[PDB]
Coordinates of C-alpha atoms and ligand atoms in Angstrom, one line a residue:
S19 CA 0.6 24.7 -28.8
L20 CA -0.4 22.4 -26.2
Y21 CA 1.8 23.9 -23.4
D22 CA 1.8 27.5 -24.1
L23 CA -1.9 28.9 -22.1
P24 CA -2.4 32.3 -20.8
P25 CA -3.1 33.7 -17.9
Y26 CA -6.6 32.1 -15.6
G27 CA -8.7 32.1 -12.1
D28 CA -6.6 32.7 -8.2
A29 CA -5.5 29.0 -7.8
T30 CA -4.6 26.0 -10.6
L31 CA -3.9 23.0 -9.6
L32 CA -1.5 20.7 -11.3
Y33 CA -3.1 17.0 -11.0
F34 CA -1.6 13.9 -12.1
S35 CA -2.6 10.6 -11.1
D36 CA -2.4 7.0 -11.5
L37 CA 1.3 6.2 -12.4
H38 CA 2.0 2.8 -11.6
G39 CA 5.5 3.5 -10.7
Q40 CA 5.7 4.4 -14.5
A41 CA 9.7 5.9 -14.6
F42 CA 10.4 6.2 -18.6
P43 CA 7.6 6.9 -21.4
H44 CA 6.5 4.0 -22.6
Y45 CA 2.1 3.8 -24.9
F46 CA -0.8 3.2 -23.1
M47 CA -3.5 2.4 -25.5
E48 CA -6.6 3.5 -23.8
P49 CA -9.2 0.3 -23.5
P50 CA -11.2 -0.4 -26.9
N51 CA -14.2 -1.3 -25.0
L52 CA -16.3 0.7 -21.5
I53 CA -18.3 -1.7 -21.4
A54 CA -22.4 -0.2 -19.3
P55 CA -24.8 -1.4 -18.1
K56 CA -28.2 0.2 -20.3
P57 CA -28.9 3.2 -17.7
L58 CA -25.4 3.8 -17.3
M59 CA -24.3 4.8 -20.8
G60 CA -23.2 7.5 -22.9
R61 CA -21.5 8.6 -19.4
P62 CA -17.8 9.9 -19.2
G63 CA -16.1 6.8 -17.7
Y64 CA -17.9 4.5 -20.3
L65 CA -16.7 6.3 -23.4
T66 CA -14.5 5.0 -26.0
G67 CA -13.4 4.8 -30.5
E68 CA -15.1 7.5 -31.6
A69 CA -18.0 8.4 -29.3
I70 CA -15.7 10.1 -27.2
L71 CA -14.1 12.1 -29.6
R72 CA -17.4 13.2 -30.6
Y73 CA -18.8 13.9 -27.2
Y74 CA -15.6 16.3 -26.3
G75 CA -15.7 17.7 -29.5
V76 CA -11.8 16.0 -30.1
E77 CA -10.8 16.7 -33.8
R78 CA -9.2 13.0 -35.3
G79 CA -5.6 12.8 -35.6
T80 CA -4.6 15.4 -32.6
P81 CA -1.8 14.7 -30.0
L82 CA -5.5 14.7 -27.5
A83 CA -7.5 12.3 -30.3
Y84 CA -4.0 9.8 -29.1
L85 CA -4.5 9.7 -25.5
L86 CA -8.1 9.8 -25.3
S87 CA -8.9 7.1 -27.9
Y88 CA -7.3 4.0 -29.5
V89 CA -9.3 4.8 -33.0
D90 CA -5.2 5.6 -35.0
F91 CA -3.4 4.3 -31.7
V92 CA -0.4 2.4 -33.3
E93 CA -0.3 5.4 -36.8
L94 CA -0.7 8.3 -33.7
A95 CA 2.3 6.8 -31.7
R96 CA 4.5 6.8 -34.0
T97 CA 3.5 10.0 -34.4
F98 CA 3.7 12.1 -31.4
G99 CA 5.9 9.6 -29.9
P100 CA 5.6 7.9 -26.4
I101 CA 4.0 9.6 -23.7
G102 CA 5.3 9.7 -19.5
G103 CA 8.3 9.1 -17.9
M104 CA 9.0 10.7 -15.2
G105 CA 11.5 13.0 -16.6
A106 CA 9.2 14.6 -19.4
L107 CA 5.4 15.3 -16.1
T108 CA 8.6 16.8 -14.0
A109 CA 9.8 19.1 -17.0
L110 CA 5.8 20.0 -17.9
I111 CA 5.4 20.2 -14.4
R112 CA 7.7 22.8 -13.6
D113 CA 7.0 24.6 -16.7
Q114 CA 3.7 25.0 -16.1
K115 CA 4.1 25.7 -12.1
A116 CA 5.8 28.6 -12.9
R117 CA 3.9 30.3 -15.8
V118 CA 0.9 30.3 -12.5
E119 CA 4.0 31.5 -10.6
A120 CA 5.1 33.9 -12.7
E121 CA 1.4 35.6 -13.5
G122 CA 1.0 35.7 -10.2
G123 CA -0.7 33.1 -8.8
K124 CA -1.0 30.0 -6.9
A125 CA -0.4 26.1 -8.1
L126 CA -0.2 23.0 -5.8
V127 CA 0.7 19.9 -7.0
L128 CA -1.9 16.9 -7.0
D129 CA -1.4 13.0 -7.1
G130 CA -4.4 11.4 -7.7
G131 CA -2.7 7.9 -6.3
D132 CA -1.9 4.4 -7.7
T133 CA 1.9 6.6 -7.4
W134 CA 4.9 4.4 -5.6
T135 CA 4.6 0.4 -6.9
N136 CA 4.2 -1.6 -10.0
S137 CA 7.2 -0.4 -12.0
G138 CA 10.4 -1.9 -12.2
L139 CA 11.4 1.0 -10.8
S140 CA 9.0 0.3 -7.7
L141 CA 10.2 -2.8 -7.4
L142 CA 13.3 -2.7 -6.8
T143 CA 13.5 0.1 -4.3
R144 CA 10.5 -1.1 -2.5
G145 CA 9.1 1.9 -3.7
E146 CA 11.6 4.9 -2.4
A147 CA 13.2 5.9 -4.8
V148 CA 9.3 6.8 -6.6
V149 CA 9.4 8.5 -3.3
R150 CA 12.3 10.2 -4.3
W151 CA 10.9 11.2 -7.6
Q152 CA 8.4 13.2 -6.4
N153 CA 10.0 15.3 -4.0
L154 CA 12.1 16.4 -6.6
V155 CA 8.4 17.4 -8.2
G156 CA 7.4 18.4 -4.6
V157 CA 3.6 16.9 -4.1
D158 CA 2.1 19.1 -2.3
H159 CA -0.6 16.0 -2.0
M160 CA -1.5 13.1 -2.3
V161 CA -4.0 10.2 -1.8
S162 CA -3.1 6.4 -1.9
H163 CA -4.6 2.8 -3.1
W164 CA -2.2 -0.3 -4.7
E165 CA 0.4 2.0 -2.1
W166 CA -1.2 -0.3 0.9
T167 CA 0.0 -3.6 -0.9
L168 CA 3.7 -2.5 0.0
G169 CA 2.4 -3.4 4.1
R170 CA 1.2 -0.8 6.6
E171 CA 5.3 -0.9 7.7
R172 CA 6.8 -0.3 4.5
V173 CA 4.1 2.6 4.1
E174 CA 4.8 4.1 7.1
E175 CA 8.4 4.2 6.5
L176 CA 7.6 5.5 2.8
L177 CA 5.6 8.2 4.9
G178 CA 8.4 9.5 6.5
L179 CA 10.8 10.7 3.7
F180 CA 7.7 11.9 1.6
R181 CA 7.9 15.6 1.7
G182 CA 4.5 16.4 -0.1
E183 CA 1.4 16.4 2.3
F184 CA -0.6 12.5 2.7
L185 CA -3.9 13.1 2.7
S186 CA -7.1 11.1 4.0
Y187 CA -11.2 10.9 5.0
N188 CA -10.4 7.5 5.5
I189 CA -8.1 5.8 6.9
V190 CA -9.0 5.1 10.7
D191 CA -8.1 2.6 13.1
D192 CA -10.8 -0.3 12.4
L193 CA -10.5 -0.4 16.3
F194 CA -11.4 2.9 17.5
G195 CA -12.4 4.6 14.0
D196 CA -9.5 7.3 15.0
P197 CA -8.4 8.8 11.8
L198 CA -4.4 8.5 11.2
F199 CA -4.1 11.0 9.1
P200 CA -5.2 14.3 8.7
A201 CA -8.9 15.1 6.1
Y202 CA -7.6 18.3 4.7
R203 CA -5.4 21.0 3.6
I204 CA -7.2 24.6 3.7
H205 CA -4.4 26.5 1.7
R206 CA -4.1 30.1 1.1
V207 CA -5.1 31.1 -2.8
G208 CA -4.9 34.7 -3.1
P209 CA -8.3 35.9 -0.8
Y210 CA -9.8 33.5 -0.6
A211 CA -9.7 28.8 0.5
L212 CA -9.1 26.3 -1.3
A213 CA -10.0 22.9 1.5
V214 CA -8.5 19.1 0.1
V215 CA -10.0 17.2 1.0
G216 CA -8.8 13.5 -0.1
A217 CA -10.2 10.0 0.1
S218 CA -8.6 7.1 -0.5
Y219 CA -10.1 3.8 -2.1
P220 CA -12.1 2.2 0.2
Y221 CA -11.8 -1.4 -0.5
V222 CA -8.6 -1.8 0.0
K223 CA -9.0 -4.7 2.0
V224 CA -10.9 -7.4 -0.5
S225 CA -9.1 -6.2 -3.4
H226 CA -6.1 -7.2 -1.5
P227 CA -3.9 -9.7 0.3
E228 CA -5.6 -8.5 3.9
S229 CA -2.7 -8.7 5.7
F230 CA -1.8 -5.6 4.1
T231 CA -4.1 -4.1 5.7
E232 CA -4.2 -5.6 9.5
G233 CA -5.3 -2.9 12.5
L234 CA -6.7 -0.4 9.7
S235 CA -10.8 0.2 7.6
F236 CA -10.4 1.8 4.8
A237 CA -14.6 2.0 4.6
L238 CA -16.2 4.6 2.6
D239 CA -18.0 6.9 5.0
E240 CA -20.5 9.5 4.0
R241 CA -21.5 11.0 7.5
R242 CA -17.3 11.8 7.9
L243 CA -16.7 12.7 4.3
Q244 CA -19.7 15.2 5.2
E245 CA -18.3 16.0 8.1
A246 CA -15.0 17.1 7.4
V247 CA -16.4 19.0 4.9
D248 CA -18.3 20.8 6.6
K249 CA -16.1 21.6 9.2
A250 CA -13.7 22.7 5.9
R251 CA -15.9 24.9 5.0
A252 CA -16.5 25.7 8.8
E253 CA -12.2 27.1 9.9
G254 CA -13.1 28.6 6.5
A255 CA -12.5 27.0 3.8
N256 CA -14.6 28.9 1.0
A257 CA -14.4 26.4 -2.3
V258 CA -14.4 22.7 -1.5
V259 CA -11.8 19.1 -3.7
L260 CA -11.6 16.4 -3.6
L261 CA -8.4 14.2 -4.5
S262 CA -10.1 11.5 -5.0
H263 CA -8.9 7.9 -5.6
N264 CA -12.3 6.5 -5.5
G265 CA -12.9 5.8 -8.6
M266 CA -14.8 8.3 -10.8
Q267 CA -18.4 6.7 -10.6
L268 CA -18.3 6.3 -7.2
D269 CA -17.2 10.1 -7.6
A270 CA -20.1 10.7 -9.1
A271 CA -22.8 9.2 -7.0
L272 CA -21.0 11.5 -3.6
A273 CA -21.8 14.3 -4.8
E274 CA -25.2 13.6 -5.4
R275 CA -25.4 13.3 -2.3
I276 CA -22.6 15.2 0.1
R277 CA -23.2 18.8 -0.2
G278 CA -20.6 21.0 -0.6
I279 CA -17.8 19.4 -2.5
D280 CA -17.2 21.9 -5.1
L281 CA -15.3 20.0 -8.2
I282 CA -13.4 15.9 -7.7
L283 CA -10.3 14.8 -8.4
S284 CA -11.3 11.2 -10.4
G285 CA -8.4 9.0 -9.5
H286 CA -8.7 4.7 -10.2
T287 CA -10.3 4.9 -13.1
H288 CA -7.8 5.3 -15.3
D289 CA -10.4 7.4 -16.6
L290 CA -10.2 11.2 -19.1
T291 CA -11.9 14.0 -19.0
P292 CA -10.9 16.3 -21.5
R293 CA -13.6 19.1 -20.6
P294 CA -15.1 19.0 -17.3
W295 CA -17.8 16.2 -15.9
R296 CA -20.6 18.3 -14.2
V297 CA -22.2 16.2 -11.3
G298 CA -25.3 17.3 -9.1
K299 CA -23.6 20.7 -8.4
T300 CA -19.4 19.3 -8.6
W301 CA -16.7 19.5 -11.4
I302 CA -15.4 16.1 -12.4
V303 CA -12.0 16.0 -14.2
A304 CA -10.4 12.1 -14.1
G305 CA -6.8 11.4 -13.5
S306 CA -5.5 9.6 -16.5
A307 CA -3.2 6.8 -15.6
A308 CA 0.7 6.2 -16.0
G309 CA 1.9 8.8 -16.1
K310 CA 0.1 10.0 -20.1
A311 CA -1.4 13.4 -18.9
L312 CA -0.8 16.1 -16.8
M313 CA -4.5 17.1 -16.1
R314 CA -4.5 22.1 -16.1
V315 CA -7.1 23.4 -13.1
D316 CA -7.2 26.6 -13.2
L317 CA -10.0 27.7 -10.4
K318 CA -11.9 31.2 -10.1
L319 CA -13.3 30.8 -6.8
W320 CA -16.0 32.8 -4.9
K321 CA -17.3 33.4 -1.7
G322 CA -19.1 30.1 -2.3
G323 CA -17.1 28.0 -4.4
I324 CA -15.9 28.2 -7.7
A325 CA -17.0 30.9 -10.1
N326 CA -15.9 28.6 -12.7
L327 CA -13.2 27.2 -13.9
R328 CA -10.6 25.7 -16.9
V329 CA -9.4 22.8 -17.5
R330 CA -7.2 21.2 -20.6
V331 CA -5.8 17.7 -20.6
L332 CA -2.3 18.5 -21.3
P333 CA -0.3 15.6 -22.9
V334 CA 3.0 14.4 -21.5
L335 CA 4.9 13.8 -24.5
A336 CA 7.8 13.4 -23.9
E337 CA 9.0 14.0 -27.7
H338 CA 8.0 17.8 -27.6
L339 CA 9.5 18.2 -24.0
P340 CA 11.9 19.9 -22.3
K341 CA 14.5 17.5 -19.9
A342 CA 14.6 17.7 -16.7
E343 CA 18.0 17.1 -15.6
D344 CA 18.2 16.5 -12.3
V345 CA 15.2 13.6 -12.4
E346 CA 17.4 12.1 -15.7
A347 CA 20.5 11.9 -13.6
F348 CA 18.1 10.5 -10.5
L349 CA 16.9 7.3 -12.5
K350 CA 20.5 6.9 -14.1
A351 CA 22.1 6.1 -11.0
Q352 CA 19.0 4.5 -8.9
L353 CA 19.0 1.8 -12.0
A354 CA 22.6 1.7 -13.5
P355 CA 23.3 -1.7 -11.7
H356 CA 19.9 -3.5 -13.4
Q357 CA 19.9 -2.2 -17.1
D358 CA 20.9 -4.6 -17.8
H359 CA 17.7 -6.2 -16.2
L360 CA 16.0 -4.0 -17.4
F361 CA 16.3 -3.0 -20.5
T362 CA 17.9 -5.8 -22.8
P363 CA 15.1 -7.1 -25.1
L364 CA 13.7 -10.3 -23.5
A365 CA 11.3 -11.5 -26.9
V366 CA 10.0 -8.6 -30.4
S367 CA 6.4 -8.0 -30.8
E368 CA 4.6 -8.0 -34.4
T369 CA 1.2 -6.7 -33.4
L370 CA 0.1 -4.1 -31.1
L371 CA -0.4 -5.7 -27.0
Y372 CA -2.3 -3.8 -25.1
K373 CA -4.5 -4.4 -21.4
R374 CA -7.1 -2.0 -20.8
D375 CA -10.3 -2.5 -22.1
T376 CA -14.3 -4.4 -20.1
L377 CA -13.0 -8.1 -21.3
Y378 CA -10.2 -8.3 -23.0
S379 CA -6.7 -8.1 -24.6
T380 CA -4.0 -9.4 -26.8
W381 CA -0.9 -9.2 -24.5
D382 CA -3.2 -10.9 -21.6
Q383 CA -3.8 -13.8 -24.5
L384 CA -0.7 -13.8 -24.4
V385 CA -0.2 -14.5 -20.9
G386 CA -2.2 -17.4 -20.9
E387 CA -0.3 -18.6 -24.0
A388 CA 2.4 -18.6 -21.8
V389 CA 1.1 -20.6 -19.3
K390 CA -0.6 -22.9 -21.5
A391 CA 2.5 -23.6 -23.4
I392 CA 4.5 -24.1 -19.8
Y393 CA 2.0 -25.5 -17.8
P394 CA 0.2 -27.7 -20.5
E395 CA -1.5 -29.7 -17.7
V396 CA -3.7 -26.2 -17.4
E397 CA -7.1 -26.0 -19.0
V398 CA -8.4 -22.0 -18.1
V399 CA -5.6 -19.3 -18.0
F400 CA -8.2 -15.9 -15.1
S401 CA -6.0 -13.6 -16.1
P402 CA -6.5 -9.7 -13.8
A403 CA -7.9 -7.2 -15.2
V404 CA -6.0 -4.3 -13.7
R405 CA -6.5 -1.3 -15.4
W406 CA -3.0 -0.1 -15.2
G407 CA -0.1 -1.2 -17.3
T408 CA 1.3 -0.5 -21.2
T409 CA 1.0 -1.3 -24.2
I410 CA 3.6 -3.1 -26.6
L411 CA 4.0 -1.7 -30.4
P412 CA 3.8 -3.4 -33.3
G413 CA 8.3 -4.5 -33.6
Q414 CA 9.0 -2.9 -30.1
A415 CA 10.9 -5.6 -27.9
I416 CA 9.3 -6.5 -24.6
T417 CA 11.6 -6.4 -21.6
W418 CA 11.1 -6.7 -17.6
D419 CA 10.4 -3.2 -17.5
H420 CA 7.9 -4.0 -18.9
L421 CA 6.6 -7.8 -17.5
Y422 CA 7.2 -5.4 -14.6
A423 CA 4.7 -2.7 -15.7
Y424 CA 2.2 -5.2 -16.3
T425 CA 2.7 -8.3 -14.0
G426 CA 4.3 -5.8 -11.0
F427 CA 2.3 -7.0 -8.0
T428 CA 4.1 -7.9 -5.1
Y429 CA 2.3 -10.9 -4.7
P430 CA 2.8 -12.4 -8.3
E431 CA 2.6 -15.5 -7.6
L432 CA 1.1 -17.7 -10.1
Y433 CA -1.5 -20.4 -8.9
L434 CA -2.3 -24.0 -10.1
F435 CA -5.9 -25.7 -9.0
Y436 CA -8.7 -26.8 -10.0
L437 CA -12.2 -25.9 -9.7
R438 CA -15.3 -27.6 -10.5
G439 CA -17.0 -25.7 -13.5
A440 CA -20.0 -24.6 -12.0
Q441 CA -17.0 -22.5 -9.9
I442 CA -16.1 -21.2 -13.5
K443 CA -19.5 -19.9 -13.8
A444 CA -20.3 -19.4 -10.4
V445 CA -16.6 -16.9 -10.8
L446 CA -17.5 -15.1 -13.8
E447 CA -21.2 -14.7 -13.0
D448 CA -20.1 -12.5 -10.1
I449 CA -17.3 -10.5 -11.4
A450 CA -20.2 -9.6 -14.0
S451 CA -22.7 -8.0 -11.5
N452 CA -20.2 -5.8 -10.1
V453 CA -18.8 -4.9 -13.5
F454 CA -22.5 -4.4 -14.8
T455 CA -24.6 -2.4 -11.8
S456 CA -26.0 -0.4 -12.4
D457 CA -26.2 2.0 -9.1
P458 CA -22.8 4.0 -9.6
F459 CA -22.9 3.6 -5.7
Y460 CA -21.6 -0.2 -5.9
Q461 CA -19.3 0.3 -8.6
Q462 CA -15.8 -0.5 -8.0
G463 CA -13.5 0.4 -11.1
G464 CA -12.9 -3.1 -12.1
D465 CA -13.2 -4.4 -16.1
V466 CA -13.4 -8.4 -16.0
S467 CA -10.7 -11.1 -15.9
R468 CA -9.5 -12.0 -18.6
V469 CA -9.9 -16.0 -19.0
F470 CA -7.5 -18.4 -21.5
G471 CA -8.8 -21.3 -22.7
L472 CA -12.9 -20.0 -22.9
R473 CA -15.2 -18.6 -24.5
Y474 CA -18.4 -16.8 -23.5
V475 CA -21.4 -15.0 -24.1
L476 CA -22.6 -12.3 -21.9
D477 CA -25.2 -9.5 -21.7
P478 CA -25.1 -6.4 -19.6
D479 CA -28.1 -5.8 -19.0
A480 CA -29.6 -9.5 -17.9
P481 CA -30.2 -10.2 -14.3
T482 CA -27.5 -11.3 -11.7
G483 CA -27.0 -15.3 -12.0
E484 CA -27.8 -15.2 -16.4
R485 CA -25.4 -12.7 -17.2
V486 CA -23.8 -15.3 -18.5
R487 CA -25.0 -18.2 -20.8
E488 CA -23.6 -20.5 -23.1
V489 CA -20.0 -20.9 -21.5
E490 CA -17.7 -23.1 -23.3
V491 CA -13.6 -24.8 -22.0
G492 CA -11.8 -25.9 -25.2
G493 CA -14.7 -26.2 -27.3
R494 CA -17.1 -28.1 -25.3
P495 CA -19.2 -27.0 -23.9
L496 CA -18.6 -26.6 -19.6
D497 CA -19.4 -29.3 -17.4
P498 CA -20.5 -27.8 -14.2
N499 CA -19.6 -30.9 -12.2
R500 CA -15.8 -31.5 -14.1
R501 CA -12.2 -31.3 -12.3
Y502 CA -10.7 -27.5 -14.9
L503 CA -7.7 -27.1 -14.1
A504 CA -6.6 -24.0 -13.9
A505 CA -3.9 -21.2 -13.3
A506 CA -4.6 -17.3 -12.3
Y507 CA -2.5 -14.8 -10.7
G508 CA -2.4 -11.6 -8.8
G509 CA -5.8 -12.5 -6.9
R510 CA -7.9 -14.5 -4.1
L511 CA -9.5 -17.8 -7.1
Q512 CA -7.8 -19.7 -5.8
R513 CA -9.1 -20.1 -1.8
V514 CA -11.3 -21.6 -3.8
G515 CA -10.1 -24.0 -4.9
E516 CA -8.0 -27.1 -5.3
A517 CA -4.0 -26.2 -5.5
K518 CA -2.8 -29.0 -8.1
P519 CA 0.2 -31.5 -6.3
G520 CA 3.7 -31.0 -6.7
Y521 CA 2.4 -27.4 -8.1
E522 CA 5.1 -25.0 -5.9
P523 CA 3.7 -21.0 -6.4
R524 CA 6.0 -19.2 -8.9
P525 CA 6.3 -14.8 -9.7
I526 CA 4.3 -14.9 -13.2
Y527 CA 7.1 -12.5 -13.7
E528 CA 9.1 -15.3 -14.1
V529 CA 6.7 -17.5 -15.8
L530 CA 7.1 -15.7 -18.7
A531 CA 10.2 -13.5 -19.6
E532 CA 11.3 -17.8 -18.9
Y533 CA 8.0 -18.7 -22.5
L534 CA 9.9 -15.1 -24.2
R535 CA 13.4 -15.9 -23.9
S536 CA 11.9 -18.9 -25.8
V537 CA 10.3 -18.2 -28.9
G538 CA 12.2 -15.4 -29.6
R539 CA 9.1 -13.8 -31.3
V540 CA 5.8 -13.4 -29.9
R541 CA 2.6 -11.8 -33.2
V542 CA -0.8 -12.3 -30.7
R543 CA -3.6 -11.7 -33.6
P544 CA -7.0 -10.5 -31.2
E545 CA -9.2 -12.9 -30.3
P546 CA -12.2 -11.5 -28.1
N547 CA -14.0 -15.7 -26.6
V548 CA -16.2 -13.3 -26.1
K549 CA -20.0 -12.3 -27.5
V550 CA -21.5 -9.3 -25.8
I551 CA -24.9 -9.3 -26.7
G552 CA -27.0 -6.1 -27.0
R553 CA -22.9 -4.0 -27.5
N554 CA -20.4 -4.0 -30.9
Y555 CA -17.9 -4.8 -29.5
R556 CA -15.0 -3.0 -30.6
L557 CA -11.1 -3.1 -31.6
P558 CA -8.3 -2.4 -32.3
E559 CA -5.7 -2.4 -35.4
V560 CA -3.1 -4.1 -34.6
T561 CA -0.1 -3.7 -36.9
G562 CA 1.7 -0.5 -38.2
Ligands
LIG601 MN1 -4.8 2.9 -10.9
LIG602 MN1 -7.0 2.7 -7.8

């Protein structure tokens, strides 16, 4: 029994992160690849497939293996059923908190951020229905990242509804530098005091439209973070927990630079850590994503920190959890009007459609194919390599709710523009230098944009300017001076391009629904357009 655990410690943290508004049970496969430059290979955040199972001592075919790796995915999805769903997550959280309290324990419900956005329910209520669900379950704290794509005003509004206490040491006014929210909160846990410090994603300005966060700075400030930890302890905190949305590698670097952080609950990177990652004098536990798991962290505290801890990744399996009737009732009420829109099949996929990967996915290829089919003049389609999304099983129907799960940006516009061949290589080399940075302190936690219509060779360990080679567009060598017509959504690439005259940008999801409804069935087979030097590029089994 995964959920039946004996008591342990003075305090229990019930933690999830990066739900990305996923209201319903769904499928979410881990990436087939998490390519690292040599210096970073074999670390948590860079483990996939069989390697991840071995690292954590997880047996193949188990519920944990199903959550942790792409290995046997389709087979395990049919065996254990879908993951997540606000209903099941709520039921699990409620079960766990009741056990702990009945033990005489103290349980905190911590949300790592990236909760309010990127789903049908979210887009339909501009995030509000997600905030309401949060209040139903009882979230004690949360940090943020994508929340800000709602715009400063809407966030300000929703925080008025949010019953938990929002934290962040780094969101400050861009002129005066005064923090807008509390950096941390101290909770009494028996005779001890536990401080929960919050950190929001520091790269919000360059990752989303600048207008969403005008007047704010989210910059990483070690001096300021260190000072908040020092203050928490001065005020009585025995132990310090960082509820983070920096990204796990950045969290790791901080563990070696900041003093006094005992545990980091790492969001943003969508990682899974069945056993805590020990860095310096800190333990790190990742928050997974899309509601697939509830991390239960039991702490035995001492006057100077965390003496020991028990970490359990609890799978959120809807077929094996009781119902949270109030959550189910609330969702039916919230989405009754939109049932037909959200859940009517648009098309049936014959193969596995997955999103997560360093370089390539079948979902993103489907999108490239959809764009080219509707805009035949397009030569290259740049798809955003976000880590949020969903997974479609073979024979499963694709719905609007799925489209919003995959492309539910608040700025979902597809842009058509010309790029010179030299800009194409430069863009890839640029992304490559960010993703394959050998220094974790500079890591931003993203993947490489998928470019449909081109093929290339990548050397993660080559010097900057030399990582991308042998570029080919439409079966011919890349010509640096030729103007290629490109398409791109969810990013900023259009800013350096020459807009296609006569084209009016429109939401990527409209283009996809139009395509899907027409073809009725899709069968995208994995055909990676990249060759990785020094690495074995892996693929999942897409049938079954
Ligand atoms: Mn996220
Ligand atoms: Mn994030």
